[PDB]
Design a protein around this ligand. Structure first.
Ligand SMILES: O=C1CCCC2=C1C1(CCCCC1)N=C(Nc1nc3ccccc3o1)N2
Ligand SMILES: OC[C@H]1O[C@@H](O)[C@H](O)[C@@H](O)[C@H]1O
Length: 391
């Protein structure tokens, strides 16, 4: 079928074998950091909103060893990574900073090294592997940033907070990959816990670990296997718009703006800005309600909010695409599906469907038969965040 299994043990084994072959000795440590699915709370993180992601068993693993020579030597075995699959560079100094370039995959590692807060950081040799589909909407880059960060902590413990670590990975995304993301993806990669979703307040940086351990419930992720151009170009546009609405209203962020306020101050903002802000302010409220619904086990309300989230993303935020809309429509027509919506940034990538577990195999036959493109499926347990295994 189209169901990709996690193969976690195999990923680690692959990394270890490649390291020994590449560097001529066994690696001294392993780390991992997962990708993520956002259950609800889309395009809210950079608006100081609420998000409700969970970590996946899809993950990036670094296996490696410190060096004595102050240089960094990398190999990736990820099919999908751009050429070359190897890069070496000296550690940044006060004299010489790292710079983004070729290959792109290495920019994530370089960025985290560049902004790593603690000293002295030694050089190191590492292999990077991942089961997160690269650029497929499940935060492959955050997983790589966080796995890198986790590895650096083993080389040179930081004395820091989870938020500070997320901010470093976020800065690497902004500065080295030119993607001005919010904090969500890094936060969940760090903080995920098996059998939990994570409610993140992106204003206060308070987090709640919300149990998500009912075996009658399942989360089916569907990869559209498309990424439209607009993905890259439009994300900063939406973010730039939101900022303009806050400015016009004298609000520090949209989070401080209530829906009742928005309808009443509309003359002060543009028509399209109003629609973007209506999505955002609206989505923050839905996410709060969705978290509360999850706690009560009220899936119908959660799912209604989720379908509601898709419609808002499609019509008000305009970050869906025909492929996503179709995957949702297909899912939403199946009995026992509570909700389905695009997840992540949009313009391609994955949908997330919350549904009765027993209905999942009905979905996989039907989605494959009734989706225009090539669907890939993950049936995902809520997973752990960043982890270390000493080798
Ligand atoms: O081109 C894009 C579009 C923007 C999003 C995005 C990419 C590329 C960047 C460089 C290689 C091609 C795909 N990669 C990631 N993430 C990522 N690359 C990884 C390599 C090894 C392990 C984990 C990894 O995660 N994200
Ligand atoms: O919900 C939209 C999300 O888009 C992500 O892919 C981005 O990395 C996050 O920061 C968040 O803004």
């Amino acid at each position: 079928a189209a169901l990709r299994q996690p193969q976690v043990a195999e990923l680690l084994a692959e990394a270890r074998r490649a390291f020994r072959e590449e560097f001529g000795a066994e690696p001294e440590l392993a780390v991992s950091a997962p990708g993520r699915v956002n259950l609800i709370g889309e395009h809210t993180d950079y608006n100081q909103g609420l998000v409700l992601p969970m970590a996946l068993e899809l993950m990036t693993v670094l296996v490696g060893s410190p060096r004595k020579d102050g240089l960094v030597s990398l190999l990736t075995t990820s099919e999908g990574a751009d050429e070359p699959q190897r890069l070496q560079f000296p550690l940044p100094t006060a004299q010489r900073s790292l710079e983004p370039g070729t290959p792109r995959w290495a920019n994530y590692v370089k960025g985290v090294i560049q902004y790593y807060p603690a000293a002295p950081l030694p050089g190191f040799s590492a292999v990077v592997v991942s089961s997160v589909p690269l650029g497929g909407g499940l935060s492959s880059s955050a997983s790589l940033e966080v796995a890198t960060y986790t590895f650096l902590q083993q080389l040179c413990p930081d004395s820091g907070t989870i938020a500070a670590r997320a901010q470093v990975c976020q800065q690497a995304e902004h500065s080295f990959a030119g993607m001005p993301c919010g904090i969500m993806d890094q936060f969940i990669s760090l903080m995920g816990q098996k059998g939990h979703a994570l409610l993140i307040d992106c204003r206060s940086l308070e987090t709640s670990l919300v149990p998500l351990s009912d075996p009658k419930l399942a989360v089916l992720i569907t990869n559209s296997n498309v990424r439209h151009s607009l993905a890259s170009s439009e994300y900063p546009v939406r973010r730039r718009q939101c900022e303009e609405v806050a400015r016009a209203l004298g609000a520090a962020s949209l989070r401080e703006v209530q829906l009742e306020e928005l309808e009443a101050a509309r003359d002060l903002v543009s028509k399209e800005g109003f629609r973007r802000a209506r999505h955002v302010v609206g989505e923050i409220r839905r996410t709060a309600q969705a978290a509360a619904a999850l706690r009560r086990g009220d899936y119908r309300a959660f799912g209604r909010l989720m379908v509601e989230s898709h419609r808002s993303l499609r019509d008000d935020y305009e970050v869906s695409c025909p492929e996503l809309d179709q995957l949702v429509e297909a899912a939403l027509a199946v009995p026992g599906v509570y909700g389905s919506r695009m997840t992540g940034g949009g313009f391609g990538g994955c949908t997330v469907t919350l549904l009765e577990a027993s209905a999942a195999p009905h979905a996989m036959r039907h989605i494959q038969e009734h989706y225009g493109g090539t669907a890939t499926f993950y049936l995902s347990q809520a997973a752990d965040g960043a982890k270390v295994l000493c080798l």
